[PDB]
Amino acid sequence: MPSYKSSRVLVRDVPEELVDHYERSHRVAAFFMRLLLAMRREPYSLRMRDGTEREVDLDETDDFLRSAGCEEPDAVSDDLRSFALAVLHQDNPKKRAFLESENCVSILCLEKSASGTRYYKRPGYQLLKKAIEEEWGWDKFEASLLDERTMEDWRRFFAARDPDDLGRELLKTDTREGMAAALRLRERGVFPVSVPEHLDLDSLKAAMASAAERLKSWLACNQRAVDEKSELRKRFEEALDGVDPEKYALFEKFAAELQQADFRELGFVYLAERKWERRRGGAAVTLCDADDSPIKVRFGLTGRGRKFVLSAAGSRFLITVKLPCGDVGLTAVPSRYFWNPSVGRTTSNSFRIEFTKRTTENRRYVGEVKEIGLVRQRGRYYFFIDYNFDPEEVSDETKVGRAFFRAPLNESRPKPKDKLTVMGIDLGINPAFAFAVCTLGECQDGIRSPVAKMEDVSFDSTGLRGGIGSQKLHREMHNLSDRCFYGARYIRLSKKLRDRGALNDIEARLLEEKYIPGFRIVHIEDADERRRTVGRTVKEIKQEYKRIRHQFYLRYHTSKRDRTELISAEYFRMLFLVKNLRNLLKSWNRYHWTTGDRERRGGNPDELKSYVRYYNNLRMDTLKKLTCAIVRTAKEHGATLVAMENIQRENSLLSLWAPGMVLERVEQELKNEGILAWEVDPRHTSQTSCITDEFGYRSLVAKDTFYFEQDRKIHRIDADVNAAINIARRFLTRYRSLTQLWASLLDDGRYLVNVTRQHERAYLELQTGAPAATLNPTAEASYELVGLSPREPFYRHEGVWLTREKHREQVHELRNQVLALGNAKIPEIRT
RNA sequence: GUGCUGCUGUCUCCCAGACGGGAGGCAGAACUGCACCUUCCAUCAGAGAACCUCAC
DNA sequence: GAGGTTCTCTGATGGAAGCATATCGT
DNA sequence: ACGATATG
């Protein structure tokens, strides 16, 4: 599997011949879609351009196979089935009939084809014989053939040159079943299909590639659906026998009368009947179309399709597709992705393209093009320049570095034995991310961190990135987003003022004490004039939203351009402001939804498409910029190991992205730049000091300052640096210190430690001496680990393992000191 | 190329109706900034909305 | 925050993708 | 040596 990065380039004046080739390629690809399914001789479901699903019967397969050439489709049935499953990759991966699904069209489509009657590349037999007959002594052949075969014919195979004889014997003894089926069909003279449009071999390869890949995907999904339905039915039938008697005949009538109006064993059994029945067993077949579901009309340089000669002049590409009708020259609209490109024909059927994506530096990127693909969108054509790239080299020393620091203490993986650079990364929204960088073998001055089995390290480089660029804009994106949230609730109640009378009691202080101050609307009692007073605010909401979006636009088109950061905390506030504005606009659009009225299958089908498009675009842009700043921060400091918080474990990156796809993108782009990363457990990183390794206070009024005590003097430090170091410190110490153990009580105050994870197993050994331990109580409401010779949270503190009630009070006792003392008398750490 | 990403003027369909909101098209003006692997497909779950029912 | 209702859109979590060599024959 | 197949 090569590495792949891709982009699109526009072509404007497409000649009629290429348009015809495009459409014919889709039509033939649809023909392949249909003919493979027909040869499967298994009925399926076709989803038309509309939502309707059609049950294509066996007759529609039979008559189509009749048209395609098979005048007696039933008589040759098993043989067609075997060929069909071969091109769709339903045979064994080793010794496959067609390693590339395309390679069947020589036998399927042509008229005088020699495919299937060759031995020149038969694996390891003809090549071995041809090699030995030249410069070997007829003795290592025995070793080579015994090695693979662990018969007397092999003696004659090397007794003479006999290439044709061995080829014939291999084609006889070794018959890949998918090709034997095709030869049998062509012997009957029914296999060469009548392709509706006349295309040469190269274009038929390209069509069959896409048709076959669509069939392979759909077949895999169908098999998954069938297997899942079978397994769920197995679970239901296992549960049905169980212990429940035939009394389950009654919950049927019970559910009937319930749904007409609309027990543990009865309810659970009911779910299985409903869950099993509604699940589909088969997927839908979506046939290819020119405009509905386009396929890439691929043009390869080895046989996949018509060859192309990619060139470049100035700041744009020059594509020439060598069609059978003639050479067709296309010029490319210049792309900032492949800006100022240079092209070069290589010695391996490829073009070496060197271009420049970004505009900050002039860094030139190198890739190889080996296939170009053609699609259309909104009647406008495109080529997919799907190129390759070699990722940056990662030292074998980094791999031994990553394995060592990842391992729990009870594993003994080797020391890195070199000077690595480790990174600490926290992730937030206002503080997009913060970092701490340490160098192994070099501790000079800073927050010194233990390193497992090595000397300590000092974090020289520390910083907070992302952040709020302009203070005013961030506050305005927050005032409006608060208003947009509170208007959606307000007009839910507003209608009930007019729809009902005097509302209720639970709402009364919910409307007055919370919603009126929020939506900033004066309350009028007369219903007719409540529509006007609510409409003018929604106008005023848009009128100030447009202002904000325009000032957000001008972050890139003023003299403030130089100060505009790569990523800001405004990227996330805008996303929520777009989100809340969407709900409010949706709610006001249904201000007329009155009495009992519901959303219909029709109505308005394009509602708020501009906002949804802006929502997805802003997110995709935010994550790409977020990854760049992280990777830019990693490369600059010489980092090769990145410790990240496992965020899988409002004001969070969650509710904007899935918990994982954020981390996946960062790791992928780090690995392209030759930087390995690991996910560190993000427990107690924001509540534990990185200096004293003791619990502190995360200030609620100010979420950037973390208070702890050192030498009985209260200190403060940035809570993003504090967590960034605590993520890196955990990695370098191999999670040596834990701050929480789960324990369960059996009797008389002996809380038994629940060992679930291997990190707890190793930890107890370094203190107790056994892979298990107990908590004995002491005089001052504390505990102590003992350890046993062969669930309630507990918090460490000063070697005492206090409980949640007394851990909260210790945190609370420190808060009172902070509030009493004040930030003026609490010194700063970083600088 | 696709986005971040809008402004002015003018024009057409739609939902409310005389408060307002949502799709779009051409026309210029302003701006030389940041980033950018993406195509296709099938299942099964969520978000919020909104109508019928609750006092949390 | 109780509890099916009917629809769009993610969103989940998968699936298939984005070419090599080999020789004959002129 | 390049083209026309063919198949790892």
JSON list of C-alpha atoms in Angstrom, two decimals, chain A residues 11 38 51 64 121 150 191 206 217 226 264 347 409 420 499 541 623 645 665 675 705 740 771 818 829:
[
{"chain": "A", "resi": 11, "resn": "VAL", "atom": "CA", "xyz": [-10.42, 21.66, -17.35]},
{"chain": "A", "resi": 38, "resn": "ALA", "atom": "CA", "xyz": [-26.77, -11.20, -13.61]},
{"chain": "A", "resi": 51, "resn": "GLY", "atom": "CA", "xyz": [-35.72, 6.57, -3.15]},
{"chain": "A", "resi": 64, "resn": "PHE", "atom": "CA", "xyz": [-30.65, -9.72, -19.72]},
{"chain": "A", "resi": 121, "resn": "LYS", "atom": "CA", "xyz": [4.56, -15.89, -15.46]},
{"chain": "A", "resi": 150, "resn": "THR", "atom": "CA", "xyz": [7.35, -29.49, 2.04]},
{"chain": "A", "resi": 191, "resn": "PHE", "atom": "CA", "xyz": [-18.88, -15.99, -23.36]},
{"chain": "A", "resi": 206, "resn": "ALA", "atom": "CA", "xyz": [-10.80, 1.03, -16.99]},
{"chain": "A", "resi": 217, "resn": "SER", "atom": "CA", "xyz": [-17.72, -3.07, -1.87]},
{"chain": "A", "resi": 226, "resn": "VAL", "atom": "CA", "xyz": [-26.39, -11.39, 6.17]},
{"chain": "A", "resi": 264, "resn": "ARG", "atom": "CA", "xyz": [-38.35, -8.17, 32.61]},
{"chain": "A", "resi": 347, "resn": "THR", "atom": "CA", "xyz": [11.85, 5.17, -15.83]},
{"chain": "A", "resi": 409, "resn": "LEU", "atom": "CA", "xyz": [6.92, -0.90, 34.28]},
{"chain": "A", "resi": 420, "resn": "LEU", "atom": "CA", "xyz": [15.43, 11.89, 21.78]},
{"chain": "A", "resi": 499, "resn": "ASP", "atom": "CA", "xyz": [-51.83, 28.46, 21.43]},
{"chain": "A", "resi": 541, "resn": "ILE", "atom": "CA", "xyz": [-29.68, 38.89, 15.35]},
{"chain": "A", "resi": 623, "resn": "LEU", "atom": "CA", "xyz": [-9.08, 20.85, 11.81]},
{"chain": "A", "resi": 645, "resn": "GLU", "atom": "CA", "xyz": [-4.18, 13.35, 25.77]},
{"chain": "A", "resi": 665, "resn": "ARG", "atom": "CA", "xyz": [-5.69, 13.29, 11.72]},
{"chain": "A", "resi": 675, "resn": "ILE", "atom": "CA", "xyz": [7.10, 11.92, 14.03]},
{"chain": "A", "resi": 705, "resn": "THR", "atom": "CA", "xyz": [-4.63, 29.34, 36.69]},
{"chain": "A", "resi": 740, "resn": "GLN", "atom": "CA", "xyz": [-6.58, 7.09, 41.94]},
{"chain": "A", "resi": 771, "resn": "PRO", "atom": "CA", "xyz": [0.10, -7.89, 42.39]},
{"chain": "A", "resi": 818, "resn": "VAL", "atom": "CA", "xyz": [-6.50, 30.81, 47.60]},
{"chain": "A", "resi": 829, "resn": "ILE", "atom": "CA", "xyz": [6.29, 29.79, 38.15]}
]
